[PDB]
Amino acid sequence: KSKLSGKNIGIYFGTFAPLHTGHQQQIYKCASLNDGVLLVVSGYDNDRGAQIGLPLEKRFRYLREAFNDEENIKVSMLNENDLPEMPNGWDEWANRLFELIHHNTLENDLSVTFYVGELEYAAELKKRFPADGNQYAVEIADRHDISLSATQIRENPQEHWTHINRVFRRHFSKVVTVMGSASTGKTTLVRRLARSINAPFSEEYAREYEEAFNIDDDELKMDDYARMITGQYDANSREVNSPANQGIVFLDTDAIVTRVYAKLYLPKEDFEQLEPLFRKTIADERMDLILVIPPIHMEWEESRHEFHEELMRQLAEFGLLDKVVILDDEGGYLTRYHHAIDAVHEYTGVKIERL
Ligand SMILES: NC(=O)c1ccc[n+]([C@@H]2O[C@H](COP(=O)([O-])OP(=O)(O)OC[C@H]3O[C@@H](n4cnc5c(N)ncnc54)[C@H](O)[C@@H]3O)[C@@H](O)[C@H]2O)c1
């Protein structure tokens, strides 16, 4: 189930940062021509992919998941940490690659077809066929378009979203988070933003937690704030990874806004016990634009300026200030929606109509 079955198989290379429609189209054509296909993800320790947060391992794992139900397609990893352009290193890169073939196949006396898209690779590869019983052959592939699409996807992700393979999409998603008091225009604001650009959105986990377990704000305890941290995060993850994500998604609240309600309203010894779960979660969050509703749930209502001042205190603590936009109105914009909807334009780049 984990080594390639057939007798003649073909080989397809790539950095795969990210994998996209182009690749897949070339791969299924490649699969229908052989009995099996060996994908080879190539990477080195600070390559184009790694620089944007998709290191060789991250790419490999995502690729394994992407082909997780294709029996006759195996994903391999060719790690490149050796000599540059004037090497005997082609000698070595070769048998690194031929190691991948021997390990991920049964059935000696194979018939291998390399599908290479760079001419120097085919020239240096043909010099280094090993003396097993396999008789390798090289064919040329048009990667002019495929490498060029990957270039554009990395540059403008939300412009080529539908061609990014779904496993890689969670990494390119823009994320807008709204934070604020029980001045919960935020929930209506979050919907109105997302539904105006057909985006998905999360809901305040605290509201759902309190209703399901049936407790008011004053009755929340340390054990409950921890359940709300992971609750809200999972809700937000669920949307970022949602199949209905079109490139940006909106989060109703954060671990920070639940940590503000937790430094307030919670004994200093108790709060200090949660700080590790708080770091772990806030570190696992990635936000692009943070919208804050200024002072305009029963216990969380009354302390608006208390919460709002502490919220900025914490937001500085985590260096998120330059992603923060405050939806004020007086003394610029007509409605806080107007201010907010235009903020999304500046921070994600989607087109919006005028009245
Ligand atoms: N059938 C199934 O597949 C199935 C069924 C039940 C459970 N599960 C489990 O559920 C999981 C599904 O995915 P997951 O929840 O583990 O994903 P995950 O927790 O691995 O994803 C977290 C990543 O997404 C980003 N992220 C998440 N929330 C964010 C936010 N609010 N803002 C910015 N960035 C954010 C982070 O950068 C982080 O690296 C699987 O790991 C699986 O084990 C799967």
Numbering used by the authors: 8 to 303, 313 to 347, 352 to 375
What do the authors of the reporting publication say about this deposited model?
Each molecule of NadRLl is comprised of two domains—an N-terminal NMNAT domain (residues 8–177) folded in a Rossmann-like fold and a C-terminal RNK domain (residues 178–379). While NadR proteins from Haemophilus sp. and most Gram-negative bacteria contain a DNA binding domain at the N terminus, such a domain is absent in the NadRLl protein, indicating that NadRLl is not involved in transcriptional regulation.
NadRLl crystallized in the P6422 space group with two molecules in the asymmetric unit. In the previously reported NadRHi crystal structure, NAD was bound to the NMNAT domain; however, we did not observe NAD molecules bound to the NMNAT domain of NadRLl. In one of the collected datasets, we observed a mixture of NAD and AMP-PNP bound at this location in the electron density. Additionally, we obtained structures in the presence of NMN and NR, which both have bound substrates in a similar area.
